Amino acid sequence: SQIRHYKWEVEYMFWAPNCNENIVMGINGQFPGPTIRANAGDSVVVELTNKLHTEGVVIHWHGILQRGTPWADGTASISQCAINPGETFFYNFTVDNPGTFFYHGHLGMQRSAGLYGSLIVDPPQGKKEPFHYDGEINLLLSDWWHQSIHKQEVGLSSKPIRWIGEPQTILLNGRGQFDCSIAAKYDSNLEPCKLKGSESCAPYIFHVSPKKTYRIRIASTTALAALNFAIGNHQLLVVEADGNYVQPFYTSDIDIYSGESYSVLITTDQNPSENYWVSVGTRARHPNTPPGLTLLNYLPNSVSKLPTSPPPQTPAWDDFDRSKNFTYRITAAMGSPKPPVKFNRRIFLLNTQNVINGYVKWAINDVSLALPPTPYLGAMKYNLLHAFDQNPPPEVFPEDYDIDTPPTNEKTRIGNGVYQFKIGEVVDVILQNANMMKENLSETHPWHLHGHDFWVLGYGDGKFSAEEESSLNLKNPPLRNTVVIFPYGWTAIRFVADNPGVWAFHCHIEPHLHMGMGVVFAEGVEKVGRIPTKALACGGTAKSLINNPKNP
Amino acid sequence: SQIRHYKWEVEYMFWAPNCNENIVMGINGQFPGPTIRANAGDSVVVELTNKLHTEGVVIHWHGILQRGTPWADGTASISQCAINPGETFFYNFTVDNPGTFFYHGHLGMQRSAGLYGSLIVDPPQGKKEPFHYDGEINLLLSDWWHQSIHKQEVGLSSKPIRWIGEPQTILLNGRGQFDCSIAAKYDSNLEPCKLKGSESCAPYIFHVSPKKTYRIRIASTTALAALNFAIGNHQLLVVEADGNYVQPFYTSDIDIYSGESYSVLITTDQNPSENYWVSVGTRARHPNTPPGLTLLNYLPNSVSKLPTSPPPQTPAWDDFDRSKNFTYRITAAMGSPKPPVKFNRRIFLLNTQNVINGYVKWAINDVSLALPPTPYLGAMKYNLLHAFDQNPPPEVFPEDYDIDTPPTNEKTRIGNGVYQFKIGEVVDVILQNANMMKENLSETHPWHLHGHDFWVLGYGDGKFSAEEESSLNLKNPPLRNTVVIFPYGWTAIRFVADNPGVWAFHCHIEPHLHMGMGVVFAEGVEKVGRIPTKALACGGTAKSLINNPKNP
């Protein structure tokens, strides 16, 4: 086991992801950030210096469990106080298992500004992957707006709210094209991009040799878009989801929601004289963004040798039965950890879009989360009972609530209480979707849990009831860290509260988390060790711990 | 009989139709143009002064037959030379039958620039309409782009072609809204308009009293958009179409393609305590334009009092079965002229989208129309045989043509020949639609005939075959001047070549006309009287009528 050390600086910089200049948040002058790669069992040390002028910053390592290091999870106001301008903080954690992961900003909407990159973990040295491939291609998906993130944040907090709208561009490894298409030859209504291939927005080409097998790692840090990935003429064999192996299955395209990572295998068994299209299109929302496009370039064909076919047409955005068909087919690989069969706690979380005092907010069992200035982890370790609400938040919603109709907003409040578990509890969480404020509308929400993987026990339409208990999968359920709820449906997950610390469970669409769509879970904080002083130096924790008497 | 005399000047002016300023082509300082209202049998005298600086101008009176006066049709390079900067021209013509008509620009793409307005012809003096209503409402529909008409024209004449794209705003009597919605109340994601009611883009509100019946006259002069009209909680009785009366029927909404006009009656039955939504949305092309909206305000309710329901959602753009279900209902009112049972001429016109010398052109039986600098009517009256191509244009296409495949463009050319008819022939035209350059695309095209109304004999899917004869309606076919061809289908029309003159038959979508999609018919030209000198004053006709010898 090696210690992988990174020395990083976060600073804004002019950059043109889609060849239209804007500012991006870069790490050591790079957009996307540098890839961390390590082998399971290695320690990763990141010393991060904040070189933003007035903003604090944190980095969250999505999919890493932070077992023994809950302070290093990178969540402002939950695991730590944000890092101030000109300061250096050390994130020191172990990577326990192989998988496609990534990192992103977790303070305000900084991740939408560009703060993200890959974190890949290979098997322990000497050990190998359960499947063979010759090469690897790594792909990070994100979306991009030409409006400022600070204008987006202010607009989401105004009365009337100003929605951010559909992204202008889908970024594949940091690059995308706006107002022109690299596939304009198939339709004279499209404007041709004039690109020599050297530009910042020039496509990241996938170069493959004929008759080989490649693992394509795909992760999504989109702020809003749900995307569908497809390669012309090539089948994809799904072998990994969220750092865990799934029972393999072929598919023509995959759906991928913000927070998810997959590994797909392909084989370059097609006609070697041509190149093929890779298309990443928007689904689950009415599309207003052109697809992200690149080439699967079979070497030695020139990359300017365009495919004979158009890019694969994206599946219809609203065919949620097609979406469920893909999603329900995901099961744990043969030999994986099976869930505990009985639970100790089951919580029901109703997901609504509400209006709290003129403002459109999202709420979970009528509580829209407002995060405190004192980090929950420090505050619970030092038993600071005034830093946030001690009253247990609701574990059920009313059985007379009608999920087919808009909310009345009668009791909807803002809060910051924490659900508390005893170390060792088996917890089931039933997520229930419902109609939004507009009549006859409900959307998909990807939910992500920090510091744990969970088994996805099942999905269903309408309101969950006791009739549905027998449908829950306890044999084969996949272990994931992100899961979707479909329009008007429910999703059930189970996990064991065995990781000391304070962990959020929230929708991974960034405007939704900004509008309060999340809850905070805490377990065994009595067993948490020493927290770095920089993670404690703000709020109530700096107040109680800085000895500065008066008269003494 | 009465002479209506209009004194008119056309001049560009600054105007903001959707509250974004641009230049509009106004008549007598107003946009849209003044309404002409007369009784059938009157003579309209319009003396037009061209106050544009470097551009010529012409006005076409859509739907008026120009019986006796082919020179006043207002088609540059067909009926007349364009009127020069600083010159006045008189258009004198009789309005023969009552209806809802309109006028628009017919030189370059000048009508897209705002040159249009209403022409309503009432019944002969003393006579009454065949139906009762207590009031009438006049609506003219158009669409609006923010780019210049001349940057659009250069874009469509360029290699590679720069397509104009979907409109930014649908206009309802010259007003529409951009980037905000007057119906934002039903959806948080929309931006409210900050309108007082006084602005240039404030909606023309329809004021009605309860328990009455009104005739809403609706005409379309859009350059591109096919629209759908619907009023919340009000069924429509279709009673007139293209100046002629149809067999009445009820419908919840109508489709209207460019160049058509309708009259619909409604009764204000619904609850008098509220206002209802009028909604005009895009159909037939994938929409990227917000609906044109206004209120049916039931007096004395305040106009700030919104309806309790959202605007009616427009029917799906591509439900062509739904479209045909409406279109195929229209039949002539009993008492109307029945067609000649036998025809003397049948022509087959294949509509394709081609690439001629790198330019994307539209063509009819592989000839893309390019108009000559000499006006056809002048050319043919003076028998100037070198002024255009005297060879007959193609009257049939290859029966071995695959209408499901892109064209090859092998023999596609540009030309300017004319189909000539003997005065009195019963001419049959079958318009055949086909696949465009993009694989698997065929669009609707509104075709309009000048100087005539035709009977719409039938419509069919696929290629017309002679075995199709028994479906053609010779019993009740409607009299129209504009008709659509649906994707991959044919439409058959019949008319009588009884009006001395040169007349066009073209696709009424303004870009397609700019790209060559139309034909020119001429009949009985030796029966045309004296043409106005200004109409003759250009090209070959000026050259051969100006006596200017040399040495003298």
Ligand SMILES: *[C@@H]1O[C@H](CO)[C@@H](O)[C@H](O)[C@H]1NC(C)=O
């Ligand atoms: C993190 O690792 C660095 C380098 O080994 C060490 O100096 C620092 O004290 C460590 N801090 C924590 C909280 O482990």
Ligand SMILES: *[C@@H]1O[C@H](CO)[C@@H](O)[C@H](O)[C@H]1NC(C)=O
């Ligand atoms: C048109 O009518 C006006 C008014 O009667 C007359 O002065 C003008 O000469 C007429 N011109 C034509 C071409 O008929």
Ligand SMILES: [Cu+2]
């Ligand atoms: Cu994340």
Ligand SMILES: [Cu+2]
């Ligand atoms: Cu995470």
Ligand SMILES: [Cu+2]
């Ligand atoms: Cu759409």
Ligand SMILES: [Cu+2]
């Ligand atoms: Cu969400």
Ligand SMILES: [Cu+2]
């Ligand atoms: Cu998070």
Ligand SMILES: [Cu+2]
């Ligand atoms: Cu016309």
Ligand SMILES: [Cu+2]
């Ligand atoms: Cu017209």
Ligand SMILES: [Cu+2]
């Ligand atoms: Cu057309």
Ligand SMILES: [Cu+2]
């Ligand atoms: Cu015309």
Ligand SMILES: [O-]
């Ligand atoms: O995470």
Ligand SMILES: [O-]
């Ligand atoms: O016309």
